[PDB]
Amino acid sequence: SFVEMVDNLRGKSGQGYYVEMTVGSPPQTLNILVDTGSSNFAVGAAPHPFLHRYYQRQLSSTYRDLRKGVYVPYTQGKWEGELGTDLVSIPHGPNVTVRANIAAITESDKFFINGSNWEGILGLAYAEIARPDDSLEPFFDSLVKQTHVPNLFSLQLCGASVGGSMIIGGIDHSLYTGSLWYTPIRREWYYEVIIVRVEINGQDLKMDCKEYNYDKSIVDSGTTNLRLPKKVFEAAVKSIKAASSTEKFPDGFWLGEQLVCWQAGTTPWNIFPVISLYLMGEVTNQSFRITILPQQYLRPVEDVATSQDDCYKFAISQSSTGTVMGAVIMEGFYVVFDRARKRIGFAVSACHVHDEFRTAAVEGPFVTLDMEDCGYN
Ligand SMILES: CC(=O)c1cc2cc(c1)C(=O)N[C@H]([C@H](O)CNC1(c3cccc(C(C)C)c3)CC1)Cc1cccc(c1)OCCCCN2
């Protein structure tokens, strides 16, 4: 019955994927950003320059005030508001209605995006990282308790403006090719995984694999970039610089500040390497790898000049909070969040990025010794 949910995500490139939801009685309709890197369901509830509509508690005959304040700070950008509950639906989702916690955003800073077309956020992670504390049941925990929807969901994000699918409660086998490869969820707070090996153009980075997961590695649909721990980032940028030394780039390009442009249709794709992330498998000593093409970590942007040059931002950035496999990483793939079986599945998506001679891939099995030593404590 999942075809009703196929293609239910829209977005403007780099500004997040959203699904359509209704809250309150009568139903008020909002576009909600789908975020696996947080756990709070929150909507705008007061006018804002970048909001074209918002939740009106006054008009919902099912609203209930919880008389507690709340705030969530993200990587950068933050909001505060007032907790409450109300009935919630997903028109292009399962045909159910749940009473769910909602934070009515009343003040915010650098959170809403000009022209993103979404007005709220759906944190799909676990209660442990909910604010103010872990006793505020996140939306998906409420959905699974109060209905018969099974405890998993899958995301198919398609690159560029953009679209995709959120299959709530199951797997749609027509959204991927090949087999699904699963990696354990190490701890139920973020969607935390263990990268066990990293290769660039088939060349192992040869780092202590604890470096890959220092201090964590997570799957985060709410962040554009692939974010790497400092030492892994420096190692990776060195190998990408070397592979593409045929041409010259500003050093501010490697920091994500300056674009790079080529005459339309002449992007030298062949000089940027593929990146392989090996993920811990489901059986002893076993792993699988996902291959990222340059078309995923060179994200397209708007031409600053009056040209039709193709221009790109570098979407690999340095991190101090661990590895983030962001929307950039997820676009090649169908990603199953099998909460019921504590695992995350990857497969090549039906809408996979296309290179002339290379292809994104999910390949296995691989044998990897001592995968347990790769998690950071
Ligand atoms: C580089 C940068 O600055 C940056 C860039 C991007 C997102 C975020 C930060 C961002 O902050 N994205 C948040 C996610 O939740 C982030 N998740 C993490 C996080 C960080 C701090 C605190 C928490 C708690 C609250 C669980 C969680 C775990 C990483 C969710 C989010 C908030 C506001 C707008 C968003 C998206 O759309 C923008 C489109 C995507 C743009 N790309």
Domain segments of the chain as ranges: 17-149, 150-377
Calculate how far, in angstroms, residue 1's C-alpha sits from the geometric centre of ligand 1. 32
Q: How many CA atoms lie within 13 A of 90 on its CB side?
A: 27
Distances (CA, A) of 231 to 31, 55, 211: 38, 44, 7
Q: What's this structure's resolution in Å? A: 2.7
CA 202 to CA 224: how far, in whole Å?
25
- β-sheet bridge partners, residue 109: 78
Q: List b or e across 110-132, with b for residues whose CB sees 16 or more CB atoms inside 10 angstroms.
A: ebbeeebebbbbbbbbbbebbbe
Calculate how far, in angstroms, residue 335's C-alpha sits from the geometric centre of ligand 1. 19
Pocket around ligand 1: residues whose beta carbon is below 6 Å from it?
15-16, 33, 35, 37-38, 72, 74-77, 111, 113, 129, 218, 220, 222-225, 324
Six token digits for residue 81:
């508001």
CATH of 150-377, one of 3.30.420.40, 3.40.50.150, 2.40.70.10, 1.10.10.10: 2.40.70.10
CA 238 to CA 184: how far, in whole Å?
30
Calculate how far, in angstroms, residue 222's C-alpha sits from the geometric centre of ligand 1. 5
CA 111 to CA 109: how far, in whole Å?
5
Ligand 1: residue of 38, 50, 136 to mutate (most ligand atoms within 8 A of CB) is 38
Ligand 1, atom nearest to 317 Cα: 1
CA 77 to CA 54: how far, in whole Å?
19
Calculate how far, in angstroms, residue 242's C-alpha sits from the geometric centre of ligand 1. 30
Distances (CA, A) of 270 to 240, 251, 293, 357: 12, 20, 10, 9
Ligand 1, atom nearest to 326 Cα: 42
Q: Which residues contact 242 (CB under 8 A, 6 or more apart)?
A: none
Ligand 1: residue of 40, 72, 74 to mutate (most ligand atoms within 8 A of CB) is 74
Using CA atoms of 35, 13, 115, 175 in order, give the dihedral in degrees to the nearest 10. Answer: -60
Strands 275-280 and 195-200, by their bridges, are: antiparallel
Chain centre to alpha carbon of residue 269: 24
CA 264 to CA 271: how far, in whole Å?
17
**Residue whose pair of structure tokens reads 């509830």 in the numeric block:** 45
Q: Are 206 and 180 in contact (CB under 8 A)?
A: no
Calculate how far, in angstroms, residue 223's C-alpha sits from the geometric centre of ligand 1. 5
SS (H, E, C) the chain: CHHHHCCCEEECCCCCEEEEEEECCCCEEEEEEEECCCCCEEEECCCCCCCCCCCCHHHCCCCEEEEEEEEEECCCCEEEEEEEEEEEECCCCCCCCEEEEEEEEEEEECCCCCCCCCCEEEECCCHHHCCCCCCCCCHHHHHHHHCCCCCCEEEEEECCCEEEEEEECCCCHHHEEEEEEEEECCCECCEEECEEEEEECCEECCCCHHHHHCCCEEECCCCCCEEEEHHHHHHHHHHHHHHCCCCCCCCCCCCCCCCEEECCCCCCHHHCCCEEEEEECCCCCEEEEEEECHHHHEEEECCCCCCCCEEEEECEEEECCCEEECHHHHCCEEEEEEHHHCEEEEEEECCCCECCCCECEEEEEEECCCHHHHCCC
Residue nearest to atom 30 of ligand 1 (CA): 222
The catalytic site residues sit at: 35, 220
Ligand 1: residue of 223, 226, 318 to mutate (most ligand atoms within 8 A of CB) is 223
CA 267 to CA 300: how far, in whole Å?
11
Ligand 1, atom nearest to 38 Cα: 26
Q: Do 17-149 and 150-377 fold alike per CATH?
A: yes
CATH number at 17-149 = 2.40.70.10
